[PDB]
Amino acid sequence: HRLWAAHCRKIQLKKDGSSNHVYNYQPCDHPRQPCDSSCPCVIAQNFCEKFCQCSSECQNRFPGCRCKAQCNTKQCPCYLAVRECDPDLCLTCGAADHWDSKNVSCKNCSIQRGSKKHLLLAPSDVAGWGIFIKDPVQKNEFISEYCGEIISQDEADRRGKVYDKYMCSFLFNLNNDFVVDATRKGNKIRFANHSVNPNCYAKVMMVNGDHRIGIFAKRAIQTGEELFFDYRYSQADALKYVGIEREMEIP
Amino acid sequence: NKRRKLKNKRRRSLPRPHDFFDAQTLDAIRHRAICFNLS
Amino acid sequence: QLATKAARKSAPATGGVKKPHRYRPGTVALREIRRYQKSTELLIRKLPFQRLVREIAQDFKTDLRFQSSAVMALQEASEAYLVALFEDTNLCAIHAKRVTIMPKDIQLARRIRGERA
Amino acid sequence: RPKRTKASMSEFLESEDTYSSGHNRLYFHSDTCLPLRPQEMEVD
Numbered sequence: 001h002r003l004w005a006a007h008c009r010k011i012q013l014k015k016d017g018s019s020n021h022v023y024n025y026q027p028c029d030h031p032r033q034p035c036d037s038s039c040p041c042v043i044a045q046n047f048c049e050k051f052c053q054c055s056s057e058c059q060n061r062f063p064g065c066r067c068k069a070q071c072n073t074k075q076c077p078c079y080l081a082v083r084e085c086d087p088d089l090c091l092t093c094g095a096a097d098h099w100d101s102k103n104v105s106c107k108n109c110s111i112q113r114g115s116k117k118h119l120l121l122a123p124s125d126v127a128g129w130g131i132f133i134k135d136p137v138q139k140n141e142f143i144s145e146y147c148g149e150i151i152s153q154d155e156a157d158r159r160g161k162v163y164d165k166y167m168c169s170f171l172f173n174l175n176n177d178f179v180v181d182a183t184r185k186g187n188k189i190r191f192a193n194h195s196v197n198p199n200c201y202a203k204v205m206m207v208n209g210d211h212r213i214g215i216f217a218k219r220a221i222q223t224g225e226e227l228f229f230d231y232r233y234s235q236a237d238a239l240k241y242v243g244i245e246r247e248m249e250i251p
Numbered sequence: 252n253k254r255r256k257l258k259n260k261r262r263r264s265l266p267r268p269h270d271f272f273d274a275q276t277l278d279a280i281r282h283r284a285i286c287f288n289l290s
Numbered sequence: 291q292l293a294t295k296a297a298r299k300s301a302p303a304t305g306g307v308k309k310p311h312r313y314r315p316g317t318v319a320l321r322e323i324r325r326y327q328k329s330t331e332l333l334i335r336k337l338p339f340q341r342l343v344r345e346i347a348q349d350f351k352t353d354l355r356f357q358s359s360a361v362m363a364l365q366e367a368s369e370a371y372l373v374a375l376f377e378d379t380n381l382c383a384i385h386a387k388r389v390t391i392m393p394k395d396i397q398l399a400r401r402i403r404g405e406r407a
Numbered sequence: 408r409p410k411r412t413k414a415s416m417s418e419f420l421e422s423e424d425t426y427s428s429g430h431n432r433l434y435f436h437s438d439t440c441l442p443l444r445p446q447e448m449e450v451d
């Protein structure tokens with residue numbers, strides 16, 4: 001698998017060095033050619049997925065998820081991978097083990113079943129409506145994915161200026177090519193609010209070739225807490241949009 | 252928490268939590284004290 | 291056109307793969323020591339050793355033939371000799387507060403034994 | 408614990424010159440914005 005990492009040196013030494021150019025997955029299908037330099041996923045700078053038609057010999061296939069304690073923490077390279085630990089791969093962490101059940105050592109196993117929490121609806125301390133958690137959770141733990149419609153940049157740009165005219169943003173930057181809409185359809189977390197130092201944060205996900213976005217806890221959480229995250233706007237934007245910070249001057 | 256400050260460490264400004272007290276109370280009280288004052 | 295762009299929520303784009311993963315200098319060496327010290331196999335390939343001994347013996351006389359058992363007699367004798375030489379050579383290198391050995395250790399190693407100088 | 412410091416007027420002069428727990432605030436059924444009752448606050 002080090003040669004795939006050696007390929008990955010080529011994958012990084014020319015195309016992934018920016019570490020921001022992220023594109024929609026496509027099936028790198030090679031009717032006669034091998035997984036060449038012009039391979040569709042190579043030019044897309046990602047694996048030859050099993051859904052693609054780069055055959056099994058392809059070194060650009062992701063090796064596997066071999067974390068025998070759990071796929072959930074730094075040494076797990078699949079945990080460093082943007083993707084949920086594939087059921088076919090993390091036999092070492094119970095990825096496919098009792099996919100109907102809800103107990104396993106791994107934590108990168110949420111979207112594959114929907115291990116969702118129990119949200120709350122109410123006004124928020126900071127602005128209007130709000131979302132709250134029911135039960136205590138620990139740092140670096142999953143919170144339900146930011147589900148929503150998927151739209152293009154320009155329409156959103158067309159929508160955003162209208163949205164911002166009424167000061168609306170149900171939009172998360174999906175990738176360099178697309179953006180997730182959550183205006184009419186939406187998740188249950190869509191009605192939470194913002195902090196500069198929140199108790200939880202969002203991690204960019206690659207759910208089986210789908211660019212997705214969940215939430216993870218920055219610190220300890222017990223019952224009856226607010227739920228915020230850093231929207232990561234411009235500073236002029238932040239004051240314009242999320243100026244309220246809910247703090248006083250201690251020193 | 253040892254470094255806890257006074258009972259004001261919340262914010263500079265936040266949305267109104269609404270006033271439960273009512274106005275029909277006020278004017279009704281107004282004449283109530285009025286008829287209370289004269290006696 | 292896209293003269294302007296809307297403001298959207300954003301998170302780090304970080305998605306990079308595992309670091310390099312290489313055994314440290316010295317470690318694999320100790321692996322080697324166990325593997326070979328707990329072993330018996332002669333360490334010179336037979337054909338290179340056969341061609342060496344046949345050519346060197348041809349200096350002293352021509353038309354020599356060798357019993358195949360006789361050749362490995364040279365091989366096992368030599369490998370015992372060098373291995374004996376290398377062990378004591380290391381002792382001198384350890385004496386000089388040096389982890390590795392240097393060519394100047396052997397001439398000291400052979401000299402102390404007495405067959406060379 | 409009561410602070411019970413001294414009475415110097417500088418207390419207010421320099422000043423001018425909550426251990427909640429549980430699920431405190433009221434909530435709502437996050438499907439119609441209807442007010443949420445504690446009786447079913449789990450199964451919902």
Ligand SMILES: Nc1ncnc2c1ncn2[C@@H]1O[C@H](CSCC[C@H](N)C(=O)O)[C@@H](O)[C@H]1O
Pocket residue numbers: 124126127128129130167168169191192193194195240241242243244245
């Ligand atoms: N911390 C904050 N201070 C001021 N405005 C905020 C804010 N966090 C979010 N907002 C505004 O709220 C909008 C998100 S929709 C949420 C509105 C409101 N918090 C409610 O729930 O009813 C954004 O456009 C942003 O401008």
